[PDB]
Design an enzyme around this catalytic site. Structure first.
Site, PDB file in Angstrom:
ATOM      1  N   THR A 111       0.737  -1.256   0.000  1.00 11.97           N
ATOM      2  CA  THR A 111       0.000   0.000   0.000  1.00 11.97           C
ATOM      3  C   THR A 111       0.779   1.329   0.000  1.00 11.97           C
ATOM      4  OG1 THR A 111      -2.344   0.338   0.533  1.00 11.97           O
ATOM      5  CG2 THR A 111      -0.738   0.837   2.272  1.00 11.97           C
ATOM      6  N   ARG A 112       1.980   1.345   0.593  1.00 11.75           N
ATOM      7  CA  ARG A 112       2.750   2.592   0.757  1.00 11.75           C
ATOM      8  C   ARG A 112       4.214   2.476   0.318  1.00 11.75           C
ATOM      9  NH1 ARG A 112       1.368   1.952   6.499  1.00 11.75           N
ATOM     10  NH2 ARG A 112       0.225   0.232   5.479  1.00 11.75           N
ATOM     11  N   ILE A 138       5.805  -0.118   0.307  1.00  9.87           N
ATOM     12  CA  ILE A 138       6.271  -1.333   0.990  1.00  9.87           C
ATOM     13  C   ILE A 138       6.359  -2.568   0.066  1.00  9.87           C
ATOM     14  CG2 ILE A 138       5.723  -2.992   2.816  1.00  9.87           C
ATOM     15  CD1 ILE A 138       4.617  -0.587   4.448  1.00  9.87           C
ATOM     16  N   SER A 195       2.497  -7.251  10.258  1.00 11.09           N
ATOM     17  CA  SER A 195       1.894  -6.564  11.370  1.00 11.09           C
ATOM     18  C   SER A 195       2.321  -5.133  11.561  1.00 11.09           C
ATOM     19  CB  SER A 195       2.025  -7.353  12.637  1.00 11.09           C
ATOM     20  OG  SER A 195       0.917  -7.104  13.416  1.00 11.09           O
ATOM     21  N   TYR A 225      -7.947  -1.096  12.847  1.00 10.34           N
ATOM     22  CA  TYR A 225      -6.639  -1.345  12.220  1.00 10.34           C
ATOM     23  C   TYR A 225      -5.676  -2.063  13.174  1.00 10.34           C
ATOM     24  CZ  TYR A 225      -1.911  -0.571  10.504  1.00 10.34           C
ATOM     25  OH  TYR A 225      -0.609  -0.741  10.120  1.00 10.34           O
ATOM     26  N   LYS A 266      -4.293  -6.190  12.993  1.00  6.75           N
ATOM     27  CA  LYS A 266      -2.881  -6.520  12.998  1.00  6.75           C
ATOM     28  C   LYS A 266      -2.543  -7.420  14.168  1.00  6.75           C
ATOM     29  CE  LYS A 266      -1.205  -4.069   9.495  1.00  6.75           C
ATOM     30  NZ  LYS A 266      -0.293  -4.657   8.477  1.00  6.75           N
ATOM     31  N   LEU A 270       5.944   2.535  12.502  1.00  4.71           N
ATOM     32  CA  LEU A 270       5.240   3.364  11.574  1.00  4.71           C
ATOM     33  C   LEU A 270       6.147   3.779  10.446  1.00  4.71           C
ATOM     34  CD1 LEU A 270       4.618   3.509  14.432  1.00  4.71           C
ATOM     35  CD2 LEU A 270       3.271   5.440  14.127  1.00  4.71           C
TER      36      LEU A 270
END
Lengths: 268, 254
Positions: free
Chosen positions: A13-14, A16, A181, A197, A201, A229
């Protein structure tokens, strides 16, 4: 025989999944990318530059599959994907299964097989629990937990069959599954607006751990990674203080996670 | 004038919800029991014997809700339940919301109101991860986590509105309370094969509550999670229904 290992990268998603794919590709793997949308897929898939410089037999495809609609996606007839090339622009294709690209890539001298599943589980939440709709809870749990569990189960069965079907494969890294996670899944990091969220996880984490015990007597390795994060989006002051509680666990970046995934897969 | 607290008890199996309802009733509360089925309710409901020994204003009712069918039960126009009496057999009742029993019981000088919610989160799992179906996963997640979360949010909304609607409630002995019940299987060494999803749902419930507690600080509402030892049910790491009831009570009353 030859035998060519492939990784499925899920729900990234980011940047990653991009970082993960790039690692696996530099290390000579092929990827099946599973995105929710044609747009997410495009972001995850590696560039033509890293494509062209890849070993001759290296392959990458992407498949749009909406994890929000779990479990309906399990029952689809065929899946609409996209096949990538060293020299020309990408081509639409269709797949019987999520493992199908392996069949389609393979020939008499070379057998592509899935050896690595990475579930990124990256749908984020930014609303207080009391103001979060049923539909939103469903999306978070379907994308982050339910769909990953199914990919995990489906993939384990495929892995277990392949060891039987291609005995020479025991030579080969052991079949691996990694679920990602968040530091938010436990401990002191509690972030308002992050209710379901975090729950998802924690569920992914716990699931993976009991599964590892079920897979002990089997060849299969089940890992769960709990990064900090990653920069952008997701600010409260107490949290900034809280975050200090430690480094380097409080913060992460795509390339770090990518490395951390490879570290686990490479272990011997 | 007189404010009468009512407990909602959800998803009770294996006599935990029975134990909980016993304690709460002995201590003077009224209960709304939400059960999956009529037979599930009968086990949880306090015996007609215990009811007659209760005070005049005490009530009990039960509503059937199939939590496996989340998020659909959220949309029903009405709910079918059962009013329990001290001196007669139960009457079938219709309720427009899950809190509507309170309105029905209430009268000019006495106001019944929900002040305590317990999500039992019952469904258990016996199958290995790779031999459990999507349908089984949906049920475990819906009963043990999805529905409890919906019960929780709905209840907090109701709690906030009613603290405004009835300002004399700040002066009550106990602050509005939510308790979600988890399991020792939710974390740590106790990793029981055949429990991957069940364990997962409990961890989800624990973590959700913990983070919710953080959002509920600025507000009156207490949010507790409890992590019992396995129940007498299968084969500080073991727990009997009766002992969970005391934990729930001490959490609420102190």
């Amino acid at each position: 025989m030859h035998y060519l290992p492939v990784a499925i990268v899920t729900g990234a998603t980011r940047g990653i999944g991009k970082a993960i794919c790039q690692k696996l590709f530099q290390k000579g793997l092929s990827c099946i990318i599973l995105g929710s949308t044609k747009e997410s897929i495009e972001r995850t898939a590696i560039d033509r530059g890293q494509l062209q410089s890849g070993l001759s037999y290296q392959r990458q495809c992407a498949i749009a599959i909406d994890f929000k609609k779990w479990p309906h996606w399990l029952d689809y007839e065929s899946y609409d994907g996209i096949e990538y090339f060293k020299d020309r622009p990408p081509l639409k294709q269709k797949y019987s299964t999520l493992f199908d690209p392996c069949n389609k890539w393979s020939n008499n001298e070379r057998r592509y097989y899935v050896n690595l599943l990475i579930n990124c589980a990256g749908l984020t939440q930014e609303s207080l629990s009391v103001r979060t709709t049923a539909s939103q809870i469903q999306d978070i749990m379907n994308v982050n937990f339910m769909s990953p569990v199914t990919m995990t189960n489906i993939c384990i069965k495929y892995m277990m069959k392949s060891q039987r079907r291609w005995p020479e494969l025991s030579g080969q890294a052991r079949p691996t599954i990694v679920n990602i996670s968040s530091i938010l899944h436990s401990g002191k990091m509690k972030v308002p607006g992050t209710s379901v969220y975090s729950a998802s996880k924690a569920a992914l984490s716990r699931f993976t751990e009991v599964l590892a015990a079920e897979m002990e007597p089997r060849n299969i390795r089940c890992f769960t990674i709990s990064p900090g994060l990653v920069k952008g989006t997701d600010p409260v002051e107490a949290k900034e203080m809280l975050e200090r509680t430690i480094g380097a666990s409080g913060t992460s970046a795509p390339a770090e996670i990518a490395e951390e995934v490879w570290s686990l897969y490479s272990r011997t």
